[PDB]
Design an enzyme around this catalytic site. Structure first.
Site, short mmCIF file in Angstrom:
data_model
loop_
_atom_site.label_atom_id
_atom_site.label_comp_id
_atom_site.label_asym_id
_atom_site.label_seq_id
_atom_site.Cartn_x
_atom_site.Cartn_y
_atom_site.Cartn_z
N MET A 1 0.85 -1.23 0.00
CA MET A 1 0.00 0.00 0.00
C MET A 1 0.86 1.25 0.00
SD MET A 1 -2.98 -0.96 2.78
CE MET A 1 -1.95 -0.65 4.20
N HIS A 134 0.81 -5.23 5.21
CA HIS A 134 1.46 -3.92 5.20
C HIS A 134 2.00 -3.53 6.56
CE1 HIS A 134 1.94 0.45 4.19
NE2 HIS A 134 1.66 0.56 5.50
N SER A 150 -26.40 2.17 8.33
CA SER A 150 -27.33 1.99 7.19
C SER A 150 -26.95 0.85 6.23
CB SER A 150 -27.55 3.32 6.44
OG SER A 150 -28.68 3.23 5.58
N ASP A 225 -35.39 9.29 12.26
CA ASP A 225 -34.70 8.87 11.05
C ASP A 225 -35.69 8.89 9.88
OD1 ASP A 225 -33.23 7.42 9.03
OD2 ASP A 225 -32.09 6.46 10.63
N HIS A 260 -30.58 10.31 11.07
CA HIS A 260 -29.74 9.40 10.29
C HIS A 260 -28.30 9.88 10.25
CE1 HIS A 260 -29.70 5.95 7.63
NE2 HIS A 260 -29.04 6.62 6.68
#
Lengths: 283, 283
Positions: A1, A134, A150, A225, A260
């Site tokens: 990476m 890594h 969500s 929400d 939310h």
């Protein structure tokens, strides 16, 4: 990476990483927060899965996991939400609930998307192996937690169940999750486009899985929400676990007046970090 | 004062407000977080934002809300300028002058003069507009001032000019401009907004203000801030006070590895909250 940037946060560092994914066939971004404990003289990992349209940066800047990470001694990873790029397929109608920023943590079978949208293998197989290879002391593979909001909350709960037989994840929580994708519009749209369903739906998966010991799924959701009633309905998991061994082990705290947004997320981050801290054996 | 939207955060609420300002002759957006205490003399902290920012950036990325709950204060996040197609902007489209960039001056130079009365907006008009709409919160007597960069400049400037009348009871800043007369953004702002200066420059202002008690300005700045050498130069305030009674009452804490980002702000918001809480008599 490749290290793209490093920000000092709290007593540790937030590291913006990029790498070439064999799952997605593309360059992918990911942020990780390393706790003050990494720079002192094994540290377990929480994976936080993001919602629709989100980048790794969103949760990283708005949720303030970093303070809890220093409080308990865990690293936390914020992956992306889809393959990105010009040669990567997108929603043909330009909607934001499907396509880029909207992989739904699935391995795409359906032809146009199948080439890049291998988001299940990305999250659960390749990424933790890329990070381990890594940075390696950080445990990215054994002593691990999963969470998300969500769309991300779905992926977390889904991953926890599918991997449960091998104890792939040692704890699971979610913020305002989609629990029954087969029966919500964003979920249906996703499964149709990406797949053409059961092995990917938690409300079905949870029937066939023998619950163990004290294991439970902590869920938080606000009653204000705006997507709750149409798109989330976390309560249907409560229905699905009736007369199961999981009954009384999904606790949904429906919390008054909350959104939310990452105002909601950041509010209950401490309680969740505690929950995971416990299950990772940190406190 | 119109309510644009409420959000439950921690045990209180952040409210996005808007009103028609006399100062700016424009609609202005302000965010305010009311702590748990206001739903159970609550003092107020005013946080001034940097260039390009709206009230939202700090609201979402600094995490003052946990601290406001902790000690018992309200916190106000004003905007950084008038906004709109009718309001003058930078003639070259730069982000360091014009919209998003009022530098908290009362502009005299003609185009900007119609709208950019930002010193009046912050110190005279807004706390009174808030006091009308809400009132017991204290927007006027027991109040603290803080901010970042352009906002840090604003906070120190406001604190000093009213110091003798104890206008603000507590002052701090994150990576402020302290000497606008000698850094590019300040020079541009002054030329642009006022023509000709001294009365808005803290480094000049402090020469004529009689320090008293154990009053002090707490400043943080990261040594990895890319704007440090050229644009900010906080140390100039330290050398400024060498001549004055303020010697030993301005402390710059230059912290290793930190940024100009809100990763930097959020890290030291906890200490800054304690600092203010002490000065406001909450602890």
């Amino acid at each position: 990476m490749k290290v793209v940037k490093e920000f000092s946060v709290c007593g540790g560092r937030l590291i913006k990483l990029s790498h070439n994914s064999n799952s997605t066939k593309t360059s992918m971004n990911v942020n990780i927060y390393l706790p003050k404990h990494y720079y002192a003289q094994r540290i377990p990992t929480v994976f936080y899965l993001s919602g629709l349209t989100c980048t790794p940066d969103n949760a990283s800047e708005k949720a303030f996991w970093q303070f809890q990470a220093d409080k308990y001694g865990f690293a936390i990873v914020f992956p992306d939400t889809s393959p990105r790029g010009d040669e990567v397929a997108n929603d043909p109608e330009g909607s934001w609930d499907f396509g880029q920023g909207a992989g739904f943590y699935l391995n795409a079978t359906q032809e146009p998307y199948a080439q890049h949208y291998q988001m299940y293998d990305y999250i659960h197989k390749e990424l933790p192996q890329t990070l381990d290879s890594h940075f390696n002391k950080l445990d990215f593979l054994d002593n691990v937690a999963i969470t998300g909001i969500s769309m991300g909350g779905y992926g977390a709960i889904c991953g926890y169940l599918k991997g449960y037989s091998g104890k792939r994840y040692k704890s699971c929580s979610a913020f305002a999750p989609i629990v029954n994708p087969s029966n919500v519009p964003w979920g249906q749209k996703a499964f149709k486009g990406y797949l053409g369903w059961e092995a990917y739906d938690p409300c079905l998966l949870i029937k066939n899985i023998r619950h163990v010991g004290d294991d439970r799924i902590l869920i938080h959701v606000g009653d204000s929400d705006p997507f709750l009633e149409e798109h989330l309905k976390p309560e249907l998991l409560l229905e699905a676990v009736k007369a199961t061994s999981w009954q009384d082990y999904v606790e949904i705290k429906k919390v008054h007046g909350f959104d939310h947004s990452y105002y909601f997320v950041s509010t209950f981050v401490p309680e969740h970090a505690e929950f995971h801290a416990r299950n990772l054996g940190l406190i």
